[PDB]
């Protein structure tokens, strides 16, 4: 924690910084769609469920004018082995996550919360 960091909040810098990291952490699980505005999507795949079930949902994160100041743009470009409901649940969740994270980059965070969700859903299917 730097002495101060109170008030002036760089939005253009914050993003850039984070990205650089997402480039090393996600070498194949991160593809930059655009740059200006700087848009990119991530790839999250759940673990083999009860019957070797795996789901994947391509999320689209777009940096807005208010970020991390304000919650970023989260949308589902494509999804697999998921229904309107299952897909919705993964959304309503973020709202609470990003909402509480408001004030700082919530990229690496969202993905985390999402991953667990997919693992829970894909596993729940075992019931059927």
UniProtKB/Swiss-Prot annotation:
Domain of life from the UniProt record: Eukaryota
Residues in RWD domain copies: 17-121
Modified positions (N-acetylthreonine) in chain numbering: 9
Family: Belongs to the RWDD1/GIR2 family.
Stated role: Protects DRG2 from proteolytic degradation.
Subunit structure: Interacts with DRG2. Interacts with androgen receptor.
Designated name of the protein: RWD domain-containing protein 1
Origin species: Homo sapiens (Human)
Lineage: Eukaryota, Metazoa, Chordata, Craniata, Vertebrata
Gene responsible for this protein: RWDD1
Parent sequence residues shown: 1 to 121 of 243
